[PDB]
């Protein structure tokens, strides 16, 4: 059922989006790295959803940012056609666990949670080839995430920062 509307505004990213490229300790040195980074002083399409074609292209990677506190946001969906003819992700978070499945989901036009049944996300999945369960990622505050994939490896970075009253 279509009940979501969306508007877009534009703003800048300033000096944000730097992550540790490798898990090796370094101190008092300047290191030159080459990888997928968010360039300085770039567009960031501030999306506002109120209650719609939210099939946003992925391209090389995605930097996601959220400043809300009510935790109305949860989980993500990934795919190439968002249909049952191709496999898709179902990264979904709640207050206790995160489940990650790769399967041929039949995604609806707009997916959501009734809150707590995901019947409106997909109709039925048949051939699943990957399942995973872990502790949920999400825990006046800004939450930043980086998603990318290289050589069949999906990598997710995150960070939590305190932000004062700034628009």
């Amino acid at each position, epitope marked *: 059922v279509n009940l979501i509307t969306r508007t877009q*505004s*534009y*703003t*800048n990213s300033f000096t944000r989006g730097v992550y540790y490229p490798d898990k090796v300790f370094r101190s008092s040195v300047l290191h030159s790295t080459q990888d997928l980074f968010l360039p300085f*002083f*770039s*567009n960031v399409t501030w999306f506002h959803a109120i209650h719609d074609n939210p099939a946003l292209p992925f391209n090389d990677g995605v930097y996601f940012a959220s400043t809300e506190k009510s935790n109305i946001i949860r989980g993500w969906i990934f795919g190439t056609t968002l249909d049952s003819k191709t496999q898709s992700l179902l990264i979904v978070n709640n207050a206790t666990n995160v489940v990650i499945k790769v399967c041929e989901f039949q995604f609806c036009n707009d997916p959501f949670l009734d809150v707590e049944s995901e019947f409106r996300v997909y109709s039925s999945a048949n051939n699943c080839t990957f399942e995973y369960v872990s502790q949920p990622f999400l825990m006046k505050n800004l939450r930043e995430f980086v998603f990318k994939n290289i050589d069949g490896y999906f990598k997710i970075y995150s960070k939590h920062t305190p932000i004062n009253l700034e628009r």
Partner: nanobody
Amino acid sequence: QVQLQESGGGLVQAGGSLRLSCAASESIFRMELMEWYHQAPGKQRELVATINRCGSTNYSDSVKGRFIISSDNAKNSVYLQMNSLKDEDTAVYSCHARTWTSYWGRGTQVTVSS
């Protein structure tokens, strides 16, 4: 193609209102500063208003209370609001922007009759 293009000039009687607008082909985010200069026939250039990247805004002594300079992040441009014009406001205006070198524009000959 030229980067900074200006518009909003013409003849306007005293006490009216007008809108000056200069648009840049490059994104207005990296320009790091945008200023409006004006000069009158036979006089030297003086700064009217300036806005930096962060959001700090500054004006001149004879500019406060009548002029407002602001930019929107939809079409990359900077707008100046001409309010409570007098005879001495008649001049030629040009906007300036410096990322790592200065870029200038021309035009916008505004005249006030009294």
